[PDB]
Amino acid sequence: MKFVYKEEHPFEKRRSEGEKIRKKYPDRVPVIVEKAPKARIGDLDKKKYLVPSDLTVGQFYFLIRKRIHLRAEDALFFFVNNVIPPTSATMGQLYQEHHEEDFFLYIAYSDESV
Ligand code: NA
Ligand code: NI
Ligand code: NI
């Protein structure tokens, strides 16, 4: 896919900020969250988050649901490198396995599993 954050900032600028955040806040993981193309769901107002490494994927689902005003019955899937993570996984775990070279964890979200 394509993330606007990558499109707007050259790798060197992203890596510089990501690496800096990781040094100043080693207990937190930086994450870029963007909506999947052509997803008929609410768009996010905040694309970058600094979340505690012990925060679970389920808790992050709620954070995002609460921000875009989505109810439980509404479908919302997180995609990280084309993989829908288990809610029991921690953001620290995901980050460790899926973070990119610029030190950021990129998550795409949608209302369908395609
Ligand atoms: Na869900
Ligand atoms: Ni910028
Ligand atoms: Ni609102």
Side-chain angles (χ1 to χ4, degrees), residues 1-113:
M1 192 217 269
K2 309 297 181 307
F3 276 85
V4 311
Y5 184 74
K6 292 187 202 175
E7 285 173 347
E8 304 189 312
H9 321 71
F11 175 79
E12 294 297 339
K13 305 305 176 300
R14 302 193 306 257
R15 185 276 313 161
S16 186
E17 168 176 42
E19 183 155 37
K20 180 201 301 178
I21 293 173
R22 287 296 296 161
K23 301 213 308 177
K24 300 189 299 176
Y25 318 103
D27 278 353
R28 293 195 172 211
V29 303
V31 58
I32 301 299
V33 195
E34 284 180 39
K35 178 179 63 181
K38 214 170 192 176
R40 74 178 326 85
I41 45 183
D43 211 291
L44 267 168
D45 59 304
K46 185 181 177 64
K47 302 297 181 315
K48 185 162 48 191
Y49 300 74
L50 185 55
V51 302
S53 62
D54 60 0
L55 187 74
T56 73
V57 171
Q59 288 168 301
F60 198 60
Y61 260 122
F62 185 63
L63 286 177
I64 301 298
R65 280 173 174 289
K66 185 177 186 61
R67 185 175 259 72
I68 72 176
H69 306 292
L70 217 63
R71 302 196 297 188
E73 36 278 352
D74 298 309
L76 176 61
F77 306 93
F78 281 158
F79 298 81
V80 182
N81 288 146
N82 285 301
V83 178
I84 300 170
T87 54
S88 42
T90 65
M91 296 301 293
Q93 284 176 162
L94 274 189
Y95 181 81
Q96 254 198 182
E97 176 171 0
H98 286 295
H99 78 78
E100 289 202 3
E101 288 313 304
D102 59 8
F103 287 84
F104 277 95
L105 176 64
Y106 290 85
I107 297 174
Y109 72 100
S110 179
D111 54 64
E112 61 172 53
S113 303

